[PDB]
Design a protein around this ligand. Structure first.
Ligand SMILES: O=C(O)CCC(=O)c1ccc(S(=O)(=O)N2CCC(c3ccc(F)c(F)c3)CC2)cc1
Ligand SMILES: [Zn+2]
Length: 115
């Protein structure tokens, strides 16, 4: 349906130790020159570009390629984080999802969504 369901990964997500401090702006894909359509993987804090859709819109597939190598399922679209939530995608469930632990998962990378 249209409503975003809770990811089965959200409660128990393992976030790796020694995370980067993710700034509030100015990000780049670590694999190419893209400065828009960037996805923060919530396990490892990688910042990588969104996929090429079958219409030829979107990025260079760096975040999806990283998922295929790591199995790390949850990513948040940088620039969509507000006090009211964010755009969160599950590669595993293949859907936009709700992460009830989003505030904690972002706080891991020094992101205060409330700000
Ligand atoms: O990228 C990544 O690596 C991570 C994010 C990701 O894989 C992903 C996949 C599917 C969706 S979606 O199902 O919500 N939807 C898919 C069609 C999109 C679209 C594109 C162009 C349009 F012109 C349009 F009208 C719609 C809008 C978004 C959202 C995100
Ligand atoms: Zn890229």
């Amino acid at each position: 349906g249209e409503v975003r369901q809770v990811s089965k990964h959200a409660f128990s997500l393992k976030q790796l130790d020694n995370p980067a401090r993710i700034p509030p702006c100015g990000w780049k894909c670590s694999k190419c020159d893209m400065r828009e359509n960037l996805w923060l993987n919530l396990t490892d804090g990688s910042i990588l570009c969104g996929r090429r859709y079958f219409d030829g819109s979107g990025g260079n597939n760096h975040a999806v390629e990283h998922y295929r190598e790591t199995g790390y399922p949850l990513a948040v679209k940088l620039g969509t984080i507000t006090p009211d939530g964010a755009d969160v995608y599950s590669y595993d469930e293949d859907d936009m999802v709700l992460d009830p632990s989003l505030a904690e998962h972002l706080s891991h990378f020094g992101i205060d969504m409330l700000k």
